[PDB]
């Protein structure tokens, strides 16, 4: 049941900056963020959420919202990349008074901080996988602390390039959960239960 | 009780700019809007909104937004001005997506407008006093209409010719609920039941 609807809604216009930029990635796939949120919410699929490659955070603090809009202070966003500075995302966090405890941040290059990453279990996976590299990483170290139910989300997925390495991988573990699109841009894929 | 807090305290942020402006009223200000706004509500006074001089227009923005929050789809809020000119704000309300019939605007001279005012009856009457006609011409029309329980909130108040203004206005029709300080600058009173 949609708690906190209206506080969503204006976030997005806000974050996207349609109201006078905190994400390029546009309405859309802000949308389809908070139903893949909502879902595992509604659906008790334990685990953190987790974004590789935030630039300015925008979806990283839309998530932590969501958390704040259903009033669940268990589950941790996880601010992943190299640092657009990290204090800049951080005071973008404080700006709107999401700087908490519910939100940690991983700086550093992926090959070094993921292997030894600090996170347990995942209900949510997002990657703007623009590079090979990058979004193997991403999805080798953080996919197997996927729960069951969680969602992997990938934001250019529909970049031939993006599209190969993400097939490479599910091919690597055997993964065959169906794809399915968002906006021609990106893609989704729903854990198995 | 409050409903929708979270996006109420949001657009506060959004509409004073302070997220990166709509109103420089300021937050203490808002939040003087939002209280009163929400006891007409929750006490069942009756009666329209209206705002004479609303600049950008924020504060009707926000006073309509209060509506949505309660979902309280029969009082309309009056934007009241000479016109930053009238489309500006009416967009201004479209990028909220709150530019619908709860909102009605009346342009022109106050002189003009107000003593053919199509308004019945105010749980909340607002103006930005800096000039004398303005604000005499705004309450001698309009305080009228403010019914019992409705509130009267004068956003310079402080400035000591708009005081006097409105201590002669107090005395001409023996008005004296007792006015009380908003943060040194506005100030605001209840009329009796
Ligand atoms: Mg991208
Ligand atoms: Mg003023």
Redesign the interface.
């Known amino acids: 049941p949609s708690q906190?609807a209206?506080?969503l809604?204006?976030?997005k216009?806000?974050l996207t900056?349609?109201?006078?930029a905190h994400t390029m990635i546009g309405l859309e796939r802000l949308d389809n963020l908070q139903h893949c949120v909502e879902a595992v919410l509604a659906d008790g699929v334990p685990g953190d959420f987790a974004e590789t490659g935030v630039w300015r955070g925008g979806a990283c603090i839309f998530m932590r919202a969501v958390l704040?809009?259903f009033g669940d202070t268990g589950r941790t966003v996880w601010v992943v990349d190299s640092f657009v500075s990290l204090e800049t995302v951080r005071q973008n966090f404080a700006?709107?008074?999401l700087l908490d405890e519910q939100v940690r941040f991983l700086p550093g290059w992926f090959r070094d901080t993921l292997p030894t990453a600090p996170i347990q279990e995942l209900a949510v996976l997002r990657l703007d996988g623009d590079l090979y590299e990058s979004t193997m990483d991403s999805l080798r170290n953080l996919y197997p602390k996927l729960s069951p139910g969680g969602f992997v989300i990938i934001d250019d997925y529909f970049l031939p390039s993006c599209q190969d390495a993400v097939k490479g991988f599910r091919a690597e573990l055997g993964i065959t959960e169906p794809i399915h699109d968002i906006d021609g841009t990106g893609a989704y894929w729903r854990r198995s239960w």
Chains 1, 2 share one sequence.
């Open positions: 906190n209206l506080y809604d204006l976030l216009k806000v900056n349609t109201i006078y704040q809009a700006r709107y008074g």
